[PDB]
Amino acid sequence: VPPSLRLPVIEAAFPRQLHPYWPKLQETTRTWLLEKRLMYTDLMAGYYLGAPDEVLQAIADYSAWFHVWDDRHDRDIVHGRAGAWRRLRGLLHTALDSPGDHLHHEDTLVAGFADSVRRLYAFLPATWNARFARHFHTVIEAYDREFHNRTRGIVPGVEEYLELRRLTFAHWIWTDLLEPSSGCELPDAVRKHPAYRRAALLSQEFAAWYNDLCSLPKEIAGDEVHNLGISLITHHSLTLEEAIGEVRRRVEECITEFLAVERDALRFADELADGTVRGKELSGAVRANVGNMRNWFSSVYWFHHE
């Protein structure tokens, strides 16, 4: 790992995990992408540990779709296809709420989205489905804001980018998907516990900001506008080396902040195991989810260097 990207705490204290379904996952996702005419799963295989095979497969197919969507988004941006993007944006909002209606849409990107969403909706009650949808409507609109910014060459401010990135990276989607992976929709009072919330946040901030750190030199050279380091360079008059340093410090702080709040979240899980069956189940679900929040760190880190 190139020294500027090396994180000794990850290497020393976040040992990699791999879901045993990983060999079939890749090829099955490939088949799905081919069946859907849409054309990395190791990232998901090192993250949602303990997920039922069917849940991991649905998540990996969604991730692959997400990557294809990101490519289409990039292409509409650099070609200035405002109409095609607007129409796609509208169709994804509609398919998100009514995926069955869009399973055979003429736009294969929309039909693939609708199938992956339909499948993710088959694991937990409708209240989880509704929360997933609320979050992903927000992700689509954040992608529209990124379209605006990049087509106009606007570099968001630092705080502006941090808030936008929690949405374009889909922080709350990956957090939602913790729950079908451990087989339990968590009550609001559990998943909004400040330790759970903060652990979930820091896991995603680390993934997003580490991606920015690894991509900054490439993206500054390409004259791009959406990267934490680019916001720092543009609006704080940092050199590239200073910006690399600052992003790296923010990433390292995510890790040690996570260690503290993980300890709090696991103590909360202990408190949920109150001697009842439901309490034991909630406790096990929180423990599994927090462990996968931990797994996200190592999965993203080593994904970048493979």
Curated annotation (Swiss-Prot):
Short name of any one Pfam family annotated for the protein: Terpene_syn_C_2
Cofactor note: Binds 3 Mg(2+) ions per subunit. Can also use Mn(2+) and Fe(3+) but less efficiently, and other divalent cations such as Zn(2+), Fe(2+), Co(2+), Cu(2+) and Ni(2+) are nearly completely inefficient as cofactors.
Molecular function (Gene Ontology), one example: terpene synthase activity
EC code: 4.2.3.37
Binding site for Mg(2+) 3: N211, S215, E219
Spans through the membrane: none
Segment forming the signal sequence: none
Span of the annotated motif DDXXD motif: 70-74
Catalysed reactions listed for this entry: (2E,6E)-farnesyl diphosphate = (+)-epi-isozizaene + diphosphate
Key word Ribonucleoprotein present: no
The keyword Metal-binding appears for this protein: yes
Pathway(s) where this gene product acts: Sesquiterpene biosynthesis; epi-isozizaene biosynthesis
Highest taxon of the lineage: Bacteria
Keywords attached to this entry: Lyase, Magnesium, Metal-binding
Sequence positions that bind Mg(2+) 2: D70, D74
Binding site residues for Mg(2+) 1: D70, D74
Cofactor (UniProt): Mg(2+); Mn(2+); Fe(3+)
Enzyme class: lyase
InterPro entries per the UniProt record, alphabetical: Isoprenoid_synthase_dom_sf, IsozizSyn, Terpene_cyclase-like_2
Family: Belongs to the terpene synthase family.
Function: Catalyzes the cyclization of farnesyl diphosphate (FPP) to the sesquiterpene epi-isozizaene.
Domain commentary: The Asp-Asp-Xaa-Xaa-Asp/Glu (DDXXD/E) motif is important for the catalytic activity, presumably through binding to Mg(2+).
Full protein name: Epi-isozizaene synthase
Natural source organism: Streptomyces coelicolor (strain ATCC BAA-471 / A3(2) / M145)
